[PDB]
DNA sequence: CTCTGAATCTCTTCCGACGCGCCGCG
RNA sequence: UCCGCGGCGCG
DNA sequence: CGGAAGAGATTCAGAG
């Protein structure tokens, strides 16, 4: 079953995997983010209200004055979208906020406020986003891409190698907040704990340990455990468990219960440990020498005077033992002193402490943060609390604490943004665990650490910055607030936040201009992921780990489509079925699999969790009942892929399509070609340009419909119904009874878009593709845009191509082209330029736009109006007058202009046509300042603008008023029906049917007002519109009126253009060849494009071969249809023929027939097949060799696809059969007329007497440095002198040479390079003395 | 700079000078007042820092910014840096009388000449036009000549043609790498909008026709013209300064044409006659009464230089094919006939050129190269060496070879699940057995493809060389090598992890058949690694070249 | 005890291809 | 109205 | 920001 709209033409499809999921909305990211950013959600949940409740309320510090938030509202935009783009203003909308101001009583803080104030306050405006996901700033379109940055959390890096190369690895711990100072933990070869704050100097951890109010004993108890000793008479007996004897050599005779288990020196394996564990006693006896290097834990003090017997982190000596045993504190708590399980780094870390006191630590960090300042206790405390306790200057998002708890193997989900003490204690503990060896570090390229942002949150961040700035200002003002002396907006300013958001949208490394040439670029330039901008790395901070792709990128980030050159892998694209998780991670779908059956339902899975499960390869032979015909299948695990059993996998991939990007999915037969070749093919395909008339590619992928529909570059039926009127300007559609709204629905109007300048000087256009009075179905196309036809995407065209070397004209890759294509004008393209003339109000005479110009001929005025502006439709060429703008150059001194002079000379400043380009006037735009004279031509242009601006409204009201008149007809059925005056009295005029009933007139009079209201809204819409056209335009100061003109040029193919296909085949057209010499077949048709077969071996792209055979098959059906339809045969002949055509597949899900179809439906379907058969192909499940072979059998072509050919010049057989067929050719917008350029003598620069640069100015090329050394490599000397002295720098030399050359005496003069004289000046401008010397 | 209205975005130096002069004015004013020491030393401090920043900025903390957000420029910035004065205005400076365009082939020119589009030709030589117009006196003032050349009257194209006849020009390639990147050509007027190049120069330029663009320059004086025709010329540069091997070696198409030209199937129509000269062989081929190549005895005359400065003729009845003789028809006198009896590969033709230069001077070598290029295009167009999908014959035994391979991988796995072996040992030996399988499949497909053609041979049967298009393109040395066909037809080897570790599962598919997702993903790994490698390597290469050319 | 000194760790600086085209903002 | 920054693209 | 380099402060370090 198919809709009638699909029945325009049905596409042959292949493939055996039955799809289940539909392609989602291709603009979900931007739409969801912007919708979430502006909507009335209670409790915020990442919204504007969240930022408001963060910044609010505002309280005067001890001033007992409170400003508290109420609500915000937005009004309608004052302008439209289209004329807003035309004019130049942004498409913003006002921000209306209600603020509540109260002042507490000075006698009672908690007491009630004396008064309450509330009012609506306006501040700034914010840009709006159109359904296509666009933005408007200054009469243009700009788009913000999404940023990709590391998530706020913890990282652990190896950094093996460079430092102390003949040494083992290091380790480091990093914490990055969402907004705040960085904090770094790292190691050194001497193995000490050091901390660094914000890339500053290296400091030990002990300073912050003590500054966190910890004593040494507390710290050592934290990082270490106890080993207890006793002052005992017999050798100080002591207690040991074998857990600390795991893997040590016996430094003692192992004895217990008076029985030695093993002697000194024997390594204690597991067997001896277990032997100890049988009747495991702990108290044993050891000699004394072992404690020589061992370190006490606590701080034992004397009892005679209180002196400290031994402090922490120092070892013990025999005298210490003796004079602590003299005191009798038997319990001796010592340090564990492990080597391979608990590295005692804390010991020497505390030993190299510079200080020992909290106040000293505060003073030290005080001088570390700000050098050269007097140490103050309170200032140090204030800065320390303003780094990790201050919720203002430091904070974490909920995602930050989420990953923090996940990384530390914690279980808490929700806490506070600010950090604590025990958390960084745990960071210590985990870091020292890692240094011990156990545990595992984390990489960076893994996507479970990668976070994606979008427009809403960065907009919220910039807006929050603006609000905190203005809040600072408001509090500063409120410090001197008075008793209810003002209304609560004099303290607020709309300037700062408006300026901030305007700068963010205007100037940003994320708000790039958008390349508007074709819908493919439209859809692929929005779903783009970048890693640049603030908070991320730059273009050359990139190593190699960021550059290469990672296994986690599968199904979430396209690996094959990315720009190449200066930046690779930094501008990666997002997948086709991927989506954004709630937190800000990526997600990809999977099919749930039961014990032996796969369910239809799906799950969305994050990046971190997928390692816990195993996923099967997509193109597995799933059985009819959801089983696997094999008992074993390859499946990708957390690490790699491996063949697993029948019952090991639990999730199935949705389809083969979810591996690549949108642009990549459009390349047919992709699986047969190399990665880099496909990459360059996609990079070219994104750069195509629509031609004059589009035509569907013969080989498609099935994705054309989705991208065409979702990208709003075409007219879509908001409601289905019946066509009523169609035109090249507007479309009128009848609404069906079920779909119309109960309250005065009426009909819909669709305004088309005509020829208009695009962002890339291309012709955006909309052609209707619907006949008259056709039933249209809900959500379907009506009018085709550029490079689109009948609702499918069509960039290039289809050519008859052959692969053969011919007379060297295809030497490397040069594309030979037949004359027939330019004969048909089938690659003809259009460009639209833009020329601007300003009218400033400067001194020495305000500028005039008069038609009077001196020193010119009458040829200009022959093509000019008395206003000076060109008439519409003039065949102007380069260097022609367009607008006539001219600027002029007591009682005794002012009259000399007549006595000794003649007249003031007014200087011409006419904007001419740039040289080299033709064109024709298609549109003139004139803007005027507030209160300036409007010349004649400007008056009619608004008059033509005026009368059309009221016809469309009148046409709208005429249809709009029709609905209310049916209400008259339905009520007033019976009565006096007029024979002839039924129409002379129109559908409205029935309350004047001579006499009228006493009750019928009531409804007639009642509705008479509502027509007037419809007239009233007609009046206001007229009155509002007539003001917009009549009102001026605020501009930059000084200028008075804008003169915008438009040109249209018809660009043809000429030798030098840049041609390309869909499999990476580059090329430039070398020679255009007349028809007679082209090769041709026995049938009589010629061939159009001839290529070089040598591309296939070197660059392995066999895919372009396989499509070419299909092109013959696609035409091979079509011409056979064409052969039969030329003679009027009965319909069932083609009906069975087309039936077998859409039959003849291996195993497909298409399963279409023709019996159910009406005869006229089949006939109109036949004529759309006059050009061939559109054939679909999935990216990986495409057609194999066999079914291509048997498809040609239905045609009348040889089985091999291999055809002998006849020569165009000599006309004989070729003793090798050649391969011909079709191939999809598009055109790039890299022409030759815009590149070829030269100068002989033009302008020069001011600071140096050197020629200009660039083609826009009449400038030349740059003699690069590199060819300099190249030139003396040959014995050439004079040219080096001659090129850079007499042609570039010397001023007297060239003029003599210029005068000398016109006489033939070619001679050179040395001169002296003035640039060197420029050099000596500034080096003189310092204390340096330098000059020339003796001659 | 005069900008819109009374606004002028002037240089930062003006701001620095204004700041320091205001500072000095305030300071010298306040010392008149006998001010207290604290404020005067504060002013002297801030003046000192101001003038220090004026001399050099960035050497102090909190470098003073400029207009909005960036550190202002200084004199030290004006002297040093890539944006400084040296490397943008002294070592390299923009020059007039130049131009730029895009390249095409136009493979019918001579090696000592190049084309040039008509409008460019008119634009470049305007002073020469004025001079010659004065010489014939058809104009009087500069204005008359200017309006005549702007009208593009037909009476000036003949002068324009006259001033070209031997007036040379220069060409340039923007990433100029070595000394051959600059050459000179005798220009010839051509219609169009693009530059035309002789094909044999693009190899030296390493300039593919993908859309590279050239620059042009015009020598002016007699010194310049003689200097250009002496050393800038393309003719007198045929050996690379890096190595004595030549630099006009043919690249892609003429080599294919000649390689196809000198191959002989054992049986073909027109086999087994005798001819007395290459001329009648050419006539017979144009008649179509004999094959392009078949074993034919011919009478060949050859010259040789045994005499010290003189040539000696001698005749014989050699045995060869027709194509060898018809190629011999154009070869110069010196070389012996034995120089063409081989298959004329890439190395062979390079040796041809080298020997011709070493024995027969310079000019005959040049004309020989030009004429062999002409014949190469002619017979390459005549051949019709197309490509076809049916060409790539896949070997059949490879399937059961693979089947055996997973048999031993299952076997080694089931030893490993019994504690017999460790992970590393099994890793190494599965790599070994997979590599051995690759060797076997590669050798099998090579022997299947290499000589598949068979013929009855005027009788029972005979086995000879192949005639597949892929093979003849491969062994010609034109494009690709053995590994390309190995990748395409046979197994695509085995790829490694990004770190460098090898994947245990090899690429068991090939481009002619379909490809599953994961192996394509690994191929993406490899390709992205290579592209990143070259993209990063370019900058280091250029920088190293700069330092080395500076040091010596 | 005081070196002199011989590393040794710290801190700062200088640098990172070429050429062109297009667009935007002070 | 021609100087400087940023971004994109091409080789 | 990786790396080199180079100057400089530090810090044992055997000879005393
Ligand atoms: Mg190139």
Residue numbers in the entry:
A (entry chain C): 2 to 890, 897 to 1342
B (entry chain D): 253 to 804
Sentences from the paper on this structure:
RNA polymerase (RNAP) frequently pauses during the transcription of DNA to RNA to regulate gene expression. Transcription factors NusA and NusG modulate pausing, have opposing roles, but can bind RNAP simultaneously. Here we report cryo-EM reconstructions of Escherichia coli RNAP bound to NusG, or NusA, or both. The clamp and shelf module of RNAP (collectively called the swivel module) rotates relative to the RNAP core module producing interchangeable conformational states that have been termed non-swivelled and swivelled.
Particles were initially sorted into five classes. Two classes (~40% of particles) contained very weak or no density for NusG but differed in their swivel module conformation (~1.3° to 3.4° rotation). Here we show swivelling also occurs in a canonical EC.
